[PDB]
Design brief:
The structure is a homodimer. By secondary structure, chain A is α/β, with parallel strands linked by helices. Chain A folds into three domains: about 1-75 and about 160-225, P-loop containing nucleotide triphosphate hydrolases (Rossmann fold, 3-Layer(aba) Sandwich); about 85-160, no CATH class; about 280-535, no CATH class. The first copy, chain A, has 22 helices and nine strands. Chain A has helices at about 45-50, 95-105, 120-125, 145-155, 175-190, 205-210, 230-235, 250-255, 265-270, 280-295, 310, 315, 330-335, 335-350, 360-370, 375-390, 390-395, 410-435, 445, 450-455, 480-490, 525-535; strands at about 10, 20-25, 30-35, 60, 80, 165, 195-200, 215, 225. In chain A, the strands form two sheets. In chain A, strands 5-6-7-3-8-9 form a six-stranded mixed β-sheet, with helices on both faces. The first copy, chain A, starts with 7 loop residues before the first strand and ends with a helix. The complex binds ligand A8S. Ligand A8S sits at the interface of chains A and B. Chains A, B: It is a multi-pass membrane protein.
Chain lengths: ~550, ~550
């Protein structure tokens, strides 16, 4: 319940650099310590010794919680708020925390007690007035910048921690907003008895006064530690004082650099003055939350009105160039089944490469704190993009089948619909597999266009006389199989239009109807087992 | 030479809002006034009465320079630095100002005196240590954030102004950097005798002390105007004083909101206490600078290593699927001239839509201050993208003509090369025309893909039996003419392969060889006169 961080001589290196060189401090419960210092002075590198996320040869020193070397028993009461607010844009403020409660709180609790443990942090972090507004981001009209930091603090206030370690929470806020956000972080130490240690960039006048304890670092030597009242009165005991009306934070940061109307002199004054079946049951609940959580993310990636327009446009071009087409024109119709097969191998695999890059930050953050394990995260993008990446092609083909006059009958329709969707999902798994192998979104959006070019050229339409050494590349192609199958569903084995009439080199093809459905399934599962094995390195 | 801004009762409205409600002040030469206030209190709306860029029914009030109503004779000595540093990323620090000097200083001066009037502002704004480093941006390794504001202040220090009106220059800078940047803005008033009025967001302790005069606005009523020493000593004459060690800017901003341990009380204490051939010669020099200026911008848009890879890839696919192709296979070769014709109508027109959107901020800023006129700006993108958007296609076709075994002979080569480049530039003018009509880069990158889809479908390859009502749309198509011409250059009028053998429906076509070269020229000039008429509204 109480956490007395009692770190001493916290040293640290990096490969040449040294961030911390013997810091020492104590942080008792009910006490609002604030670590101050110049930029690059070693602030964040020491908050990540209170967050316990830096231990090895770099960190040297004994970091203690209640005089005990740190454990994950001691890491269930510590919540480290980082500077990046990683929130999903389309979730309401309440949904954003209702979902994190179910994922974070232990499942032993009921699912109706988890709803109030996530709605009390709303009411006590002052979010009651904006609990039902979209979080948004720069592009989406959302919440204020001061509310987007409270919401990111309610994440770590859901496990009810003891040692709460924020990392520059006020940076980028208003003048009054960054005062209230520290008025609230005082109530967590003065009204709840927590141990809150935060670093602030440039405190205002009222924001420095509300500190109980203060810690100053120049370059990693702990120039001063103690109360906020005893800081400005300590330094003049060596001969330093403001020459003009100052903010006591302003005066103390200047001393951190050595600028007096002195850095090395203020460090030597520290030597002598201030020296079985459930496991498959939790997985299917991590997946049921991760599917309903990021459901509006899979409804903005898919029903963007610049994708509905690029498909309502193709549906009126593709259904006007071929209006009441005739099946006897075997060459006008094999070029329709290759536009349908080009459009839907490029549209899915391209838009599916901006999915893993865009969420590598929210994933690795929320994966390292428990809360899911990449088997339920991967399988919630997979199962969530299947459901949404089939509504545009299913409705393009429903419009481009009765105006184009393709093969009538409910059986040839549902077999063309079935073959499109199985190909829309087999090419989309090419996006997911390249997006995850190359975690860059613009470097991987070019390799999925140089790859759908090698797939469209070798797809069997432009070239009928492929060289003897380039014949294999149509087999690893995904458009070869959707086009072999789209033709065989509208014409067949010839013999019904060879009865009516160049129509045996483009109508009989090379592969069966089942080796074309059995390899558009080995590319469904095969391009997802590679999208996962590529994420097993993050 | 001296500027005594003597504005009085500067009122302002907007449609309901009111930013300023009777401000009054005086700003004499040699005097560093700093206007302070809360966010939205009316700071920037009053700096844009010193920048003279807000006059009409909204602004009401007499704004005076040397007791004279403002003119562009009085607007040649005023330089308004705005918050956005709009610099071209690839220009060196010296080139960025050497180019602005030639465009800004009057051409009566020599071109070697303009070189020193632009290198003295380098030396006296402390840029000598980084004059030969790339400016860069977030993506490009460039200069510091404090040097990127000096460079944007050397722009307005090139016409040698008198009333220099900066707008929040320190916002987003370091702790020490924002001190030096105000140490330098004091030398412009203490070492050069200028009239410098700037608004600062949250001054530090040493940054408030370096103000000569100060102006405080709560919501547009001028709570206080006067020296920096007389501000904290004035308010206690009504009973206000800091209850704890403050920065005097911190204490005064709190009073701006009415927060004392009062807003309306501090305003009433102001009523009674502080109450022919040369014109075508300048144009061809504005164009010679604007071409050498943004030349490295037309070398990053064009030689991006993800465009060299998307064209070195197509050149090895297109030259491996058709390796030693045979001219007797009339259908394998008409599908090669439609890949060449699809690739080069989509690659140029797509990448040419992100040009006018990305520079609508640097253009409108630098156009309103003289310095060019959109006839020389437009004609420097046009003439600058022609030269660079022909190096990739000219070198794709040089590789895909002697491996593919197209029609041998220097005359059929240079006629295919000539027809490609004329089509690469006629489709690129479709990007420029849509990018400028729709100044959004992602909303216009979708209409130039729904348009190159209607152009590729009606290009005469996929459909040979186009409906009776959709036959016109191949004539307004740009791929129809590059494909009609690419075929006629490799086959001709038939008669040489009809001698050797479906090859009269795809080889003779509809349009002549001169109506196909005479409409790929009416789309060069026609898609540029529309890209310009769309920019004549910005
Ligand atoms: C998928 C893709 C990748 C490229 O690099 C070229 C291009 C843009 C043309 C393309 O859309 C390819 C499609 C092609 C060749 C044919 C078509 O569209 O009918």
């Amino acid at each position: 319940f109480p956490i007395t961080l009692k770190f001493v001589d916290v040293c640290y290196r990096v490969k040449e650099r040294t961030i911390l060189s013997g810091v020492t401090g104590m942080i008792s419960p009910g006490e609002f310590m604030a670590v101050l210092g110049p930029s690059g002075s070693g602030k964040s590198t020491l908050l990540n010794a209170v967050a316990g996320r830096l231990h090895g040869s770099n960190l040297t020193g004994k970091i203690l919680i209640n005089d005990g070397k740190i454990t994950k028993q001691t890491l269930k009461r510590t919540g480290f708020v980082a500077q990046d607010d990683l929130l999903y844009p389309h979730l309401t403020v309440r949904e954003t925390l209702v979902f994190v409660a179910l994922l974070r709180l232990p499942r032993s609790l009921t699912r109706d007690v988890k709803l109030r443990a996530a709605e009390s942090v709303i009411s006590e972090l002052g979010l009651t007035k904006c609990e039902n507004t979209v979080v948004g981001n720069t592009f989406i009209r959302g919440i204020s910048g001061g509310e987007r930091k409270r919401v990111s603090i309610a994440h770590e206030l859901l496990i009810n921690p003891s040692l709460l370690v924020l990392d520059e929470p006020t940076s980028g806020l208003d003048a009054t907003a960054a005062l209230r956000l520290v008025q609230t972080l005082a109530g967590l130490a003065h009204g709840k008895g927590k141990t809150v240690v935060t670093s602030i960039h440039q405190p205002s006048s009222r924001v420095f006064q509300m500190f109980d304890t203060v810690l100053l670092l120049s370059e990693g030597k702990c120039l001063f530690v103690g109360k906020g009242r005893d800081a400005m009165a300590y330094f003049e005991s060596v001969g330093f004082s403001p020459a003009f009306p100052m903010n006591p934070a302003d005066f103390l940061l200047d001393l951190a650099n050595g600028v007096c109307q002195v850095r090395q002199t203020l460090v030597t004054a520290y030597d002598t003055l201030l020296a079985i079946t459930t496991c498959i049951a939790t997985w299917f609940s991590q997946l049921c939350i991760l599917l309903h959580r990021l459901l509006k993310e899979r409804r903005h990636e898919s029903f963007d009105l610049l994708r509905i327009f690029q498909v309502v446009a193709a549906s009126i071009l593709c259904g006007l160039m071929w209006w009441h087409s005739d099946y006897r024109d075997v060459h006008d119709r094999l070029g329709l089944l290759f536009f349908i097969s080009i459009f839907w191998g490029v549209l899915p695999s391209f838009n599916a490469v901006f999915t893993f890059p865009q969420e590598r930050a929210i994933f690795t953050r929320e994966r390292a704190s428990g809360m899911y394990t990449l088997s339920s995260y991967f399988m919630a993008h997979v199962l969530g993009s299947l459901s949404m990446e089939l509504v545009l092609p299913a409705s393009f083909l429903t419009f481009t089948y009765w105006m184009v006059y393709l093969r009538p009958g409910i059986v040839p329709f549902l077999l063309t619909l079935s073959v499109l969707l199985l190909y829309v999902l087999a090419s989309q798994g090419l996006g997911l597999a390249l997006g995850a192998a190359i975690m860059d979104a613009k470097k991987a959006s070019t390799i999925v266009t140089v790859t759908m070019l090698a797939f469209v050229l070798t797809g069997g339409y432009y070239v009928n006389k492929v060289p003897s050494g380039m014949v294999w590349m149509k087999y690893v192609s995904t458009t070869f199989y959707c086009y072999r199958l789209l033709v065989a569903i509208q014409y067949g084995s010839g013999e019904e239009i060879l009865r009516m009439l160049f129509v045996e080199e483009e109508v009989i093809g090379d592969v069966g109807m089942w080796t074309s459905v059995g390899v558009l399934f080995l590319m469904f599962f095969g391009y997802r087992v590679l999208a996962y094995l590529a994420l097993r390195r993050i």
